[model samples]
Target: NPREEILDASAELFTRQGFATTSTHQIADAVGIRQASLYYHFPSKTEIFLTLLKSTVEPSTVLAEDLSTLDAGPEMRLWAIVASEVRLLLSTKWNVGRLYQLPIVGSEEFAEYHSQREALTNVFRDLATEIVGDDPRAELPFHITMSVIEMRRNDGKIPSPLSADSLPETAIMLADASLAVLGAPLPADRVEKTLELIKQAD
Candidate 1:
């Protein structure tokens, strides 16, 4: 019960007050417990925040699996991933906090998230290579995808009337349109080849 209280309190406080600004006492107070009891459950706010992170960041496979068997075609897969991610960004509450507070966390704690992100990027990179079928453009898609996600997360500038639930369709369409601006085409059989390489890489 104390542990559940800690988790619940931390989730609410961290999201509402911003991770850096929230205190253990605030969490404890929120849980109707003493600050010492909170520490018994978590050593520090960082641990609570880390717990928050681990709970919310759905396994990376969410994207990897989507990319692997996607019948959506190369271009379609690209849009699908972007759309899905935007939707994910909007839906996950802890994700919203991380997206907002990550810049302040700096390298030590953020490294793990970055490492996870890189692993996921490799998955996308493989998909990109399948589509562009070349060295540089393959890499470009990874960066482009990252930029799109960051843009949507920070300011949600992917246009109005878009929620986490609705953004996938819009994200895919916009990602495709963005690709058109650069005269880019989706790689052929990119999804299948990407899954194959990801499995081999794993």
Candidate 2:
């Protein structure tokens, strides 16, 4: 079994405050566990950070894998993936996926998780390619969708509870834009079908 208390405490603290600033001791305190006991679970802070990173991205990668086998066409499938990732990045606990922009995460030390993200990237790459074959711009959708991390309100301002203000409107907009960039704006009817892919996935 996983250490729920440790990760639960670290998710918010690590994402908002950052991995560098959060101490192992602080994680222990936040989890209300003994220092030695926490140490027994994971020897290093980076290991804990890595576990959290992999776990958070697990859903997206799994979704990408699952969507690959679905019967929907490229446009419908692509929109679903983009919107799903947006919903994930925006709503993931404490903006954990948003913090993926952290420069430290790019280091070789975190190289292990890079492939996990690339797994999703490959799915996007293949789908975008089918939508607009032989065009270099096909790569645009995946890159644009990644910006949802940057889209999060990182500043100190309070976010509104209403979805009209805050599923998120931005998620749908970005998914729309990702498809638009590929010169294949999704039709409204496809929206329902696209959503079904995700609902059916459940």
Candidate 2, 35-151: lDDT as tens digits? 667878887888888888887778778977887788977888888788777766665545677546676688886565788788878899899899999888778888887786766
Q: How close is candidate 2 to the true structure, as a TM-score?
A: 0.81
Q: CA lDDT, every prediction? A: 0.56, 0.75
TM-score of every model?
Answer: 0.61, 0.81
In model 1, which runs have C-alpha deviations exceeding 4 angstroms?
Answer: 1-5, 15-18, 58-61, 69-72, 94-101, 109-112, 133-170, 181-202
Q: What is the lDDT of residue 101 in candidate 2?
A: 65
lDDT of 1 by residue, 72-165 (tens): 5656565555544544454543334353245455557677776666666676676667665665665555455445434443332223342322
In terms of lDDT, the best-performing candidate is: 2
On TM-score, the candidate that comes out on top is: 2
